[PDB]
Write a protein that binds this ligand. Sequence first.
Ligand SMILES: OC[C@H]1c2[nH]cnc2[C@H](O)[C@@H](O)[C@@H]1O
Ligand SMILES: [Cl-]
Ligand code: NA
Lengths: 443, 443
Amino acid sequence: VKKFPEGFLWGVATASYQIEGSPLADGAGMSIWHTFSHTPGNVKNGDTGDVACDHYNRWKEDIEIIEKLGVKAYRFSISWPRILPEGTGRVNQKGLDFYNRIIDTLLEKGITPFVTIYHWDLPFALQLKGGWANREIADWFAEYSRVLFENFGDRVKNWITLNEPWVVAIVGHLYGVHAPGMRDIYVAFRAVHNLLRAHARAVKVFRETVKDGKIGIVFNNGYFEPASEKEEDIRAVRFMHQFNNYPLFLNPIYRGDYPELVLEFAREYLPENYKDDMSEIQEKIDFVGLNYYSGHLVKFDPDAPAKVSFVERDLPKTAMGWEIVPEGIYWILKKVKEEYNPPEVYITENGAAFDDVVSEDGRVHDQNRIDYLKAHIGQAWKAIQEGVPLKGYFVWSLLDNFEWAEGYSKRFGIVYVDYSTQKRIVKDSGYWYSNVVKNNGLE
Amino acid sequence: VKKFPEGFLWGVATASYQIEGSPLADGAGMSIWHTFSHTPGNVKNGDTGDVACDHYNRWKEDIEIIEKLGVKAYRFSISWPRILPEGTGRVNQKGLDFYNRIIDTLLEKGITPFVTIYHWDLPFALQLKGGWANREIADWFAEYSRVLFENFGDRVKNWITLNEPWVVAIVGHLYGVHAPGMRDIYVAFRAVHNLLRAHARAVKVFRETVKDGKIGIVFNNGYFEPASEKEEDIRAVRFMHQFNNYPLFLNPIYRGDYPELVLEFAREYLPENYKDDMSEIQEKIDFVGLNYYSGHLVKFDPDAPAKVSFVERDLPKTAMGWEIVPEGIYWILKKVKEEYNPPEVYITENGAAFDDVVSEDGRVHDQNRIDYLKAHIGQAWKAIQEGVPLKGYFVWSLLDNFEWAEGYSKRFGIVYVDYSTQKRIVKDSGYWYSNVVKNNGLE
Ligand SMILES: OC[C@H]1c2[nH]cnc2[C@H](O)[C@@H](O)[C@@H]1O
Ligand SMILES: [Cl-]
Ligand code: NA
């Protein structure tokens, strides 16, 4: 028996471009994911977000699902180009109306909204002006964030500025695998820095406009272990933690500079006078969100672009090929407390992709996903018993959805979506979780 | 005996990033090729332009080689970020000094300068603002063009706005193979359109600042043949010529719209209201520069993104793998005259790469280059006999150099460059072309 604290927020999470469809409905502007996915070669099977789960139409049914499961919080994101179709300037009332209905409905039903301001769907109009590479995006983002705060901050009290800024910068602008699809290391590090500046401006505006709520930021994290007892493998782990995990961003926020090994690798790629922006970057935050999915074995490697390579292990893997390592969620939670001691932490995503099928009996028997979720929830509980101020846990995802460059080929939902009909079928993992939430823990 | 007209201009061509090195010397700003080539994985063997042929230091010698060969014209480019390190604003006097000495030396030796304003080295500062994706670049480019015209137009009277805008837009922003290394088709077509707009602004500034000068624009061209006499393959060739060759830009400049089959493919990717800019785009030009290297055989194919695929042929190939089809230079010259009838045409680049070796003799016996060039210059002569107003021919290139994503692995020079010592060794093609210029023709 593992009972969580009284009032612990059990949640589910989604993102706008992944679930909504109808990207150009009701006067919305194009996003960078619209243009990226519509470019041949960028997304598996030529898939796009044009339809997705059709949540733009089916949002009431989906929230009724969350309500029927008894889940207490819903993390969702707002599409910037539905709100400001050119990124700045004109506000689109029909976009505000879409999200107003969702927010009013969740509150009617007693579900706490957690709003992600940016989950990767930058307005295309801003990408034409350099997007995250342009210092002026700190102003654009702050203006966007102020619109949201002024329209929704009377009702929404839990806000997240950025989802996984490492991904946005590095996968988007170095690896070129995500929108906007660039491969330039100097751009990617300018994006890292502008992401921090934009985050901080939005937190500054939040303090002026929503006197009652809390604001934070979300990071991707892996559990890196060293391949050997060699000092060089241990240091490769230190580097991957500092670069790929929360320290890239929390070292600036809490300490006023990038982590040491990131500076060793990337000083030449940051702006020349980047320290001039650090005092502003330290704007106080209310909580940290940590996403966690996987662990990696890591070794020093002289021929790799950052002197690190991954070493495959014969461990159970998900359909993404990602190693299942539940102790990682404990470790990152312990480690964030030890390194930065944030006042609150949330697991804002944890989940798994498996090759789900609808059985003859009408059900989806995803015991593999139950097992994954139960183990990570247990490790989260552990960290709570050892003093980490974990206030909530959000499953990625409510719904099978558009998995970015993998398209529809990877199902992370606790609810199966049959894309030919848009039918929703609650998976065994969804039923299992509803019981966890009702009991406030595991048994 | 193939004699060319009186005053026919015989030339050699280079580009700034490809030969200069010292990209950050003397207060120069970074270019997108510096940042792109310093990104791992973008250029073969990790080559960069940091050093190249060290023309930044060895320029006098190189011009003396042009003199010793009696070549009458030198086509070279100006590095935008040497002149305006932030793209706009402050002029770097040292960058002005560098090209002024080159310009003064050429004139003293009676070599006619053809200056390329843009040969792909955009200032990094402007890439952070969206580069060619940003409508604003028409103003940035106009400002830059003015600085060049005001400081250099007293002596340079032959100017090219853009080298190969198809490559800049499509290879830099759709294929991601060139700087800035993006893959987004909406961005790529906005870059096509902004290239035209920036070109036209520069020509308008040129008319206000240079007395008795000529200005034109350079296009890449291939000679496309159908794989069969089937209707669909003939229509595939028509699409390739309209999109990949001069019509993409010349249809706007002479007829005030893009070609029909380009619009059938790409109307959804072009900016809203693009046709509003077409009357400005028709700013009158003085010449068309055509670059020509190779031929390709193509076929219709309902699975390729543009419904077209290339098909390999068992013909003589260069070290790049490109099929040697000299009759393509005649075809492209005849076709530009029939379709657009420009008042003057130049072959602004023609050339080949072969695995060139230095022998015990300390000479390089590149018969293969001689054969390539001789065949093309003869097809150019034939075009002149059928009334094409061809005024000059430029060999790509004077020096072996940094061949973009191929790095130093591909040698196009009529002068060999030993990168270990920076030793120039004139090749036999060099001596053979020396002859051609002397005789104003072949044999
Ligand atoms: O690849 C060889 C050359 C070429 N071929 C077609 N266009 C060009 C460019 O203008 C030039 O800089 C390249 O070095
Ligand atoms: Cl900037
Ligand atoms: Na107009």
